[model samples]
Target: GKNAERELVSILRGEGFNAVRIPTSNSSPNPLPDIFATKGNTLLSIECKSTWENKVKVKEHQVRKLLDFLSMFTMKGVPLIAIKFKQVHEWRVLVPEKAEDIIVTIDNSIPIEDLFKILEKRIE
Candidate 1:
């Protein structure tokens, strides 16, 4: 989990986003996303998941918590799930609009590079 969090932070930093891994487990009773990042007007609250298996499942509660956190912020917050699957060259990024049980596979997600382009066009 720590490695995955750190890897995601590094990838975001390289892309010029101010990113960091939060001390999630011990921070507080309130749930928190594993990562948070921003570049210009785009701010993201990201939950990190990594697996050797082909799919990653995120609980509904985790998704809701991330949304809850984002709601408190006013910086055009976007909620995302970052999945690291074994042997994949790039991270799979999921832009989640609603809180629910989420199943993420490489095929169902946008690559990080493509996601970046999409986000860039949304600048406002």
Candidate 2:
């Protein structure tokens, strides 16, 4: 859980991203996304998952929270999942365009670097 927070944000900062981690957990009674980070003009709402399993499952409630977050702010406020497999030491990033996008998907995983490219694609 929290491990993904440090893990992903660590990569962000290490990769020349001077982004600050926003601690929004206690901002409300219901648990919000773990980390909100910004790099230059890019801002993201990210959930971190460190699991031994090959796939990470996102709950419906979690999706609702992030999507609500997206609308209440800029469309650029992306919702991303950083999944790390401790057994194989690998990472994956999952970004959903809409709340329903991930509703029934099975084992949908994209590379972290590849997902970051979406930001550039949006920029260009």
Candidate 3:
């Protein structure tokens, strides 16, 4: 159901990111995170969501889950990234801390190729 997450993981790796797919603990069951990336001391926990539709909204429960994960595992100031892919090549990045404060009412659309461009900026 979430093949897009795998594809995104591949994309991250192809760009030379030290990324790992975090397994779902038995407690949470399925629908685990898409990728975890580390660049020097910066660690990123990423959750991937894919939709054929345009709008992307993070549910309250999902936000809660991220917060819980952060509190449990990320005591060292790692960033949690909520990534939503609209197409094979397009995506949105939501930083967990700013997610609540950032107004999510606007629709920001980018081309699939643009995802690679955006990702390139973080590669080195």
Candidate 4:
């Protein structure tokens, strides 16, 4: 879990985001996003999921926490789910929608590079 979050932070830095991993215990009072990142005026609250399996499962509460964390930010904020599948060269970072449980796969999400381009257009 640490490796996945740290790898994402590194990648986000390369993408021009001032990114940091946020660690919190299960009993912690505050629900924090796994990775927080900022690029210019855009703020990102991300939940990182890494798996060797083809499908990655995201709990509804995880999505809610990410949205809640973003709500505290005054800047333009985006909630994202970053899915890292082992053996895949590209990572999928998606703007999640309402669902009981979010299921992520390579076919269902776009790469980080592509998502950033879309974010640039909207944020600019």
Q: Which one wins on lDDT? A: 1
* Candidate 2: clashing pairs of residues: none
The TM-score ranking, best first, is 1, 4, 2, 3
- Model 1 scores a C-alpha lDDT of 0.84
Model 2: C-alpha RMSD to truth?
Answer: 3.3
True lDDT of residue 59, candidate 3? 52
lDDT value, residue 87 of candidate 4: 63
Estimate, for each residue in 36-84, the C-alpha lDDT of model 1 and write its tens digit.
8998867888989788888888878888877888888778888999988
Residue 20 alpha-carbon offset, candidate 3, angstroms: 2.0
lDDT of 2 by residue, 72-111 (tens): 6653577777778666787777787665535222257776
Report RMSD (Å) for each prediction in the order shown: 2.0, 3.3, 5.0, 1.8
| Deviating ranges (above 4 Å) for candidate 4 | 25-29
* Candidate with more favorable, higher lDDT: 2 or 4: 4
Which residue pairs overlap in candidate 1's backbone? none
